[PDB]
C-alpha cells in the first residue's frame, strides 16, 4: 500500500485582544501522530501516537520552535488577506493549509502537495510539477505574484521532495507494528417493525479498526444498492468505529435477505441474517 505524511494547519482570527489560534496536526498514513495548539498551557508539539514517544528532546524543542514562528506567519497572512478582500475588522476569519507527500510501496515519491483555503474556499495551491501556482480568485493573484517574485515554490519543492520524504521513511520504521494493527467487526441484525406489513432489517458492524468497511444487503443473490439506507462511519470514542446498513422488507420474507460485512481485519467476509 502507498504511504503518506500530511500536516493540516488552521489559524482562526478572534475579535478582541487575543491573537489568532494556531493548530497544526501531523498525519502519517492518515493517523494523527503529532499536534501543536497555541491555546494550550505550555504550547508545544506533543506526540499523539505511541511510537512518537521514541523521539528525543531535541526533536520536540526544534518542532515547537518552528510552530511558534508559523503562528506569527499565519497571524501576518490573516492581516494581509483581510486587506485584499477589503473586509471589516472585528470578525472571525479562517486560513487553512494542507501539505505533504505520497510515497509508493517501494518508497518512491509519487507526489508532493501544498494548498491553502481562506474562509473554507480554495485559495492557492502548488501545481503537481511543484514549480507553478494555481490561484483561485482575484486576491490569490496578489499572493501568486508575491510568491513567484520570492521563489516560494523552490523552497516548498525542496521540503516536499527532501525532508518530507526523509522524515516519513524514519516514521514508517519507528511505528510499523502500530500502523499495521486491526480490530475485526462484530456484526448482528436487528428487526424493527413498521406499518404496511413491512420490517426494517438493520445490519450493525461494531468495534472495528480501521474505519474502511463495506456493508451489503442481498435478496436471493444480487446486491440491493438501490433502496438500501446507510449511516456514515462513526467513531465509537474508544478508537474503534461503527456503521449500520438497513433495508425495508415485507413481513414473513426476512430469511431471503442476507447481509455481508467486508473488512481488512476479517479472515473472510461475514455473512448474516435476521435470527428470530
Amino acid at each position: 500500500g502507498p504511504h503518506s505524511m500530511r500536516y493540516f494547519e488552521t489559524a482562526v482570527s478572534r475579535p478582541g485582544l487575543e491573537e489568532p489560534r494556531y493548530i497544526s496536526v501531523g498525519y502519517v498514513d492518515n493517523k494523527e501522530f503529532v499536534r501543536f495548539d497555541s491555546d494550550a498551557e505550555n504550547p508545544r508539539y506533543e506526540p499523539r501516537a505511541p511510537w512518537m514517544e521514541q523521539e528525543g528532546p531535541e526533536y520536540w524543542e526544534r518542532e515547537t520552535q518552528k510552530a511558534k514562528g508559523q503562528e506569527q506567519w499565519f497571524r501576518v497572512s490573516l492581516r494581509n488577506l483581510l486587506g485584499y478582500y477589503n473586509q471589516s475588522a472585528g470578525g472571525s476569519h479562517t486560513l487553512q493549509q494542507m501539505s505533504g507527500c505520497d510515497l509508493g510501496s517501494d518508497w518512491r515519491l509519487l507526489r508532493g502537495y501544498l494548498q491553502f483555503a481562506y474562509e473554507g474556499r480554495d485559495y492557492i495551491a502548488l501545481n503537481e510539477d511543484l514549480k507553478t501556482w494555481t490561484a483561485a480568485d482575484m486576491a490569490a493573484q496578489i499572493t501568486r505574484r508575491k510568491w513567484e517574485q520570492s521563489g516560494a515554490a523552490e523552497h516548498y519543492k525542496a521540503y516536499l521532495e527532501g525532508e518530507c520524504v526523509e522524515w516519513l521513511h524514519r516514521y514508517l520504521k519507528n511505528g510499523n507494528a502500530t500502523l499495521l494493527r486491526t480490530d475485526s467487526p462484530k456484526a448482528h441484525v436487528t428487526h424493527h417493525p413498521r406499518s404496511k406489513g413491512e420490517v426494517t432489517l438493520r445490519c450493525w458492524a461494531l468495534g472495528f479498526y480501521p474505519a474502511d468497511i463495506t456493508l451489503t444487503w442481498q435478496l436471493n443473490g444480487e446486491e440491493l444498492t438501490q433502496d438500501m439506507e446507510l449511516v456514515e462511519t462513526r467513531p465509537a470514542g474508544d478508537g474503534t468505529f461503527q456503521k449500520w446498513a438497513s433495508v425495508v422488507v415485507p413481513l414473513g420474507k426476512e430469511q431471503n435477505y442476507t447481509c455481508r460485512v467486508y473488512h481488512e481485519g476479517l479472515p473472510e467476509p461475514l455473512t448474516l441474517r435476521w435470527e428470530p
Binding site: 500536516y7 497544526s24 501531523g26 508539539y45 518542532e63 518552528k66 510552530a67 514562528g69 508559523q70 506567519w73 501576518v76 497572512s77 494581509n80 488577506l81 486560513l95 501539505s99 491553502f116 499572493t143 508575491k146 510568491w147 520570492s150 516560494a152 523552497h155 516548498y156 521540503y159 516536499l160 525532508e163 518530507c164 522524515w167
Partner: peptide, 9 residues
C-alpha cells in the same frame, strides 16, 4: 517533521 512558510500571503 513540519515545514516552515517564508514569504507571507
Amino acid at each position: 517533521a513540519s515545514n516552515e512558510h517564508m514569504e507571507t500571503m
